[PDB]
Subunit: 163 residues, 6 copies
């Protein structure tokens, strides 16, 4: 209702990285999965929401808008403003778009319409194309949905994690 | 062995698209790329050339570490990326540092790993995807002989 | 009227610098004036507007909001959204706040109210405090004015440059 | 010569205020500083201490090159920054690398240049200026003996 | 083919010598190097090994871009740097990323350019020149088979 | 007191060896160093001088933070590094920022720590170890007076 959703995001990959890092969900170790095969770099800080389980068996992915990147493993208390939905070779994948919680410099961003269109297009473009040069990888759908849909998915993923 | 000076405008890894104004010598930020992409190699142009697109001939230089915008690198050609976009031809000569024995094993286009050539091609095909009216009609790699003939023609057009 | 003001800014100091660089207006050489005496860093990319002369004998100062810093000497075509007015030991100083011209990712910033308040406060704080530990330096006034005042000052400075 | 391990949370030059959660060991971004300031030295806390503010005792470490967040540095105290803010005391122990002969000339607070001590003081006085209700009542530098006694007291409080 | 996890302690280009404390898993600053030198490759150790020096077996990993201290990289051996210094034997296994086809052309020590191997050797021969009581008696490159033998020795010593 | 403008060519920490072409003022990449070493100070030359080697007189500048290639720094001499190599004499003037009270404690060569002077020497003695036909016969530090004498010699040769 009036009480806004928040959660902790663990950042795995800082904005501007071509190294695709992963944080192990059991040990907390950071691993280099791979150097990307395309001349692309992560459009925002990238990671996952703590204590969630998405429909793909992993913690629910998160994209965080920041004034300055963090590094792999760093926690950021964040709030959702939208969600990126896609289908690739492994099926559906959802990524929640967030901003820092309790920071007045982000109060103007409350929903997906508050983010410049070209910035959302840029984020989409990354995920549509970053595996273009990897064999057997493809994208069949990609689109943006609003904060309300994002929050519904976060709540579902909290429930799956508890179960 | 052909050799020429390349002015690097954009270091490898940059999303800021720097451009030298050829009238004045100043470095300008043309744009922050609209796509989440970064230049796959150090990028610039060959000094004292005039290409078919009316500008100096573009050049890509393979390096172990990027330089700064505006830096000259003595280079030699090993191939060329030939593309056609909405405006016509837009050739980019692929080079390595001249006089450096660490690059002697790279003499022609077949000596550059396919993974690297494919990533360079991917960059130029897609980097303007989000700009209206921009698209790429053709994009192919050609050999050193092809590169050298084009450099020679562009040198002559600069002198004329 | 309907045709928006633009100009070229030469950036002297990238955002986040404690090295205070200057671009020579005759030679175009970059000089290190000094390392700042305070633990502060330039809040935005900082420089001056080409072909202007402010009331202090220098080209009119400019602050440029960017997604990523440039380096000293780089030109950026920009448009004004406001102006910072201050008085220090050398008298009045004015600094025009700008965003990149023709970039739709900045269309939402048209005037000084479109910049988050805390971000304007942060910029002010820099100029109020960065010379705190330098002998004989002080600030007696600092405030923000709108795009219309900024444009009037830019126009005056263009006129002074021509004269 | 007193020696202890400092966990660096924030490298010199950072506007991101990282903080170790002492319950879990994780690194958290507490905030991006609201002022245009940057940590004047590598900054963190002394392991196995419990200060008067209920938290581990804060430490500043002078280094020739910053480390990464979470890195341990064996350090020895040369002085202490004593402040009083709206909540009470908030001491910060000033240290140099232990066992490193390049720092042997720094033994007490008088051996650190005034310019550096003044910049550190300026940071802690002003960095929360734009946060409502935050202000600094007192801020002074004290010597190694003062630092050592406070470290010792904080070690004992951690054991109790 | 043999592969293992390498924990990188020191990214390429560093003059800070970081080390993992193998009891805790914490990263520590051992020291800032005394020479104007920087690690020529990402540097670390192979997880779940015990070298004859009593530490986990050292590893050098060739990469297109460096990682952060503490990062795991799945790697495979292509050779080994054998050194004898003041404290006796020292082996460092040279590796490339495992399961990455961009490195398939590197199968043994002869596939790494001599200029890179010479630079790596030069680092380890000279980086402790300005530290007292340090010297190197021998420094030599051996092939993949010898590297794999030492990894297996070190796996067995870890289990014992 | 003597002071002059130094143009910095190479920031501290660089393995790219940049040089200004003194006819044009352009920055050029001479080469990527063949050794795993990095410039220990910001490095350049004194404007409007002519050394006995026929180039502008080299300068090393101590700074709290490095600059960019091409940046001017007003500096004053505190000593000089004298070297004899394959091409004969080579002098490099050691400097600090002029008019900056944070450097007033450095008036002569004895005011710079031996660890820093030794590291600087080590760089110039070893950075060309893996380039053929290079060697150093002598490398020695001299005081401010000798440095100032050489600056004056080089000012006179520029005018002549
Ligand atoms: Mg998936
Ligand atoms: Mg997922
Ligand atoms: Mg072209
Ligand atoms: Mg003024
Ligand atoms: Mg002014
Ligand atoms: Mg405290
Ligand atoms: Mg070992
Ligand atoms: Mg050993
Ligand atoms: Mg030795
Ligand atoms: Mg010379
Ligand atoms: Mg010479
Ligand atoms: Mg030699």
């Amino acid at each position: 209702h009036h009480h806004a959703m928040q959660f902790d995001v663990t950042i795995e990959i800082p904005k501007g990285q071509r190294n695709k890092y992963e944080v192990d969900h059991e040990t907390g170790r950071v691993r280099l999965d791979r150097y990307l095969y395309t001349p692309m770099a992560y459009p925002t800080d990238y990671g996952f929401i703590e204590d969630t389980l998405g429909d793909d068996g992993d913690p629910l992915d998160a994209l965080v808008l920041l004034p300055q990147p963090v590094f792999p493993g760093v926690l950021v208390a964040a709030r959702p403003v939208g969600m990126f939905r896609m289908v690739d070779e492994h099926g559906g994948d959802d990524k929640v778009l967030c901003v820092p919680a309790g920071d007045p410099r982000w109060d103007h961003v409350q929903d997906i319409g508050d983010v410049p269109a070209f910035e959302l297009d840029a984020i989409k473009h990354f995920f549509v194309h970053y595996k273009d040069l990897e064999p057997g990888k493809f994208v069949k759908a990609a689109d943006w949905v609003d904060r309300a849909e994002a929050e519904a998915e976060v709540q579902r993923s909290v429930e799956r994690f508890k179960a």
